[PDB]
């Protein structure tokens, strides 16, 4: 129990932090990855002067603060502001004292060696946690779907990745990163919806375009004869009621937004798209392992939640793969937390105890110890 209860799992994202206790089924804490700094001197009624704001209080009060994102494209870019988000996570969100909890953290696919050593330096030397561990994100997603070999298409708020994993070892030279994700996708909907003849003028109009994207957006299979369908004008249309009455209608654009993930050309991106990239990762791997990867395309991440994403991907890679092959696109329902759940499982596991980096290992080996 000492640490059975006690292991923490913190998944640091570009848009959201997911956090909680190893053992739980889902994150106890989910909140924006921002750190707000007040543009002016003054106070809220009853509070003192605050130097900084994090998560939702930074979002809610955004009009008087300069908002900053510590993690650009999955990599920690500002370490002063990240230690601020961690502090908030332990002390306010989970309300635990960190110096008696083992902490499993996550990093990104080709996270620079030096960063994995730096967050270890900050975990052990400024938070004084007993022990910690850094798992790679795609690797926890895979594992949370039971398996050990597969290829994860991972897509969240600032990055998309393909991480081919074989008997647990993520394959460095076959990993692909595509910098277009849910953030890019909300801003494109924004324009095709103002372009539908609308105005997201106040900040209460801006924010909810993102809630339109999440609730009403679709990834149609045969996106071709779906536009064609749009035109005959079926009961395909969908009206959403705004903060007030102002019933906005979205028929068609509803799927023009996730067609951006297959066609980056919709947004002036010259890069290849999700399905081709799944494939290219795969023809960059060893030959003998390619049947395995093909029957185990595990999807994780908030942006892979658009319904019919899996069917489109299913048919997208069948038709690029040699017919002798078995294609299989696994997309679980909890996928917006796969990464986290894979960490919860792993860290609550009976056999993981012997991989925890302890302060004994650290004080004796330097940050190098956990770096592997």
């Amino acid at each position: 129990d000492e640490d059975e209860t006690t292991a923490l799992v913190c998944d640091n994202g570009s848009g959201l932090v997911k956090a909680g206790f190893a053992g739980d089924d889902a994150p106890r804490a989910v909140f924006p990855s921002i750190v707000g700094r007040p543009r002016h001197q003054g106070v809220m009624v009853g509070m003192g002067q605050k130097d900084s704001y994090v998560g939702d209080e930074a979002q809610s009060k955004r009009g008087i603060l300069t908002l900053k994102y510590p993690i650009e494209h999955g990599i920690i870019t500002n370490w002063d502001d990240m230690e601020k988000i961690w502090h908030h996570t332990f002390y306010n969100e989970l309300r635990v004292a960190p110096e008696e909890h083992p902490t499993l953290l996550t990093e990104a696919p080709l996270n620079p060696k030096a960063n994995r050593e730096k967050m270890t330096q900050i975990m052990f030397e400024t938070f004084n946690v007993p022990a910690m561990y850094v798992a790679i994100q795609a690797v926890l997603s895979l594992y949370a779907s039971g398996r050990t070999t597969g290829i994860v298409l991972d897509s969240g708020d600032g990055v998309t990745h393909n991480v081919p994993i074989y008997e647990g070892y993520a394959l460095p030279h076959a990993i692909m990163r595509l910098d277009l994700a849910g953030r890019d996708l909300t801003d494109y909907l924004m324009k095709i919806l103002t372009e539908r003849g609308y105005s997201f003028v106040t900040t209460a109009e801006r924010e909810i375009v993102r809630d339109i994207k999440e609730k009403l957006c679709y990834v149609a299979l045969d996106f071709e004869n779906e536009m064609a369908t749009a035109a005959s004008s079926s009961s395909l249309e969908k009206s959403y009621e705004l903060p007030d009455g102002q019933v906005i209608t979205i028929g068609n654009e509803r799927f023009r937004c996730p067609e951006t993930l297959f066609q980056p050309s919709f947004i002036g991106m010259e890069s290849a798209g999700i399905h081709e990239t799944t494939y290219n990762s795969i023809m960059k791997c060893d030959i003998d392992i390619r049947k395995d990867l093909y029957a185990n395309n595990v999807m994780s991440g908030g942006t892979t939640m658009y319904p019919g994403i899996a069917d489109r991907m299913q048919k997208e890679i069948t038709a690029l793969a040699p017919s002798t092959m078995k294609i299989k696109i696994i997309a679980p329902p909890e996928r917006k937390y796969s990464v986290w759940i894979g960490g919860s499982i792993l860290a609550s596991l009976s056999t993981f105890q012997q991989m925890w980096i302890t302060k004994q290992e650290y004080d004796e080996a330097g940050p190098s110890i956990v770096h592997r």
Partner: protein
């Protein structure tokens, strides 16, 4: 050889038919499941607009 060829063609035609109406069962499933997250969603909305107008 001949026997194995003929019962093979009949295995493949039954496979092709069984794949075709499967595609159809899955598309109808997906359609109904989607119409639903829409109706069930519309409802949390009408029931919440409700405790609100009844309290007001």
């Amino acid at each position: 050889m001949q026997m194995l060829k003929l019962d093979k063609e009949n295995a493949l035609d039954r496979a092709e038919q069984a794949e075709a109406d499967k595609k159809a069962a899955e598309d109808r499933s997906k359609q109904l499941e989607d119409e639903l997250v829409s109706l069930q969603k519309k409802l949390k909305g009408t029931e919440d607009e409700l405790d609100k107008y009844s309290e007001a």
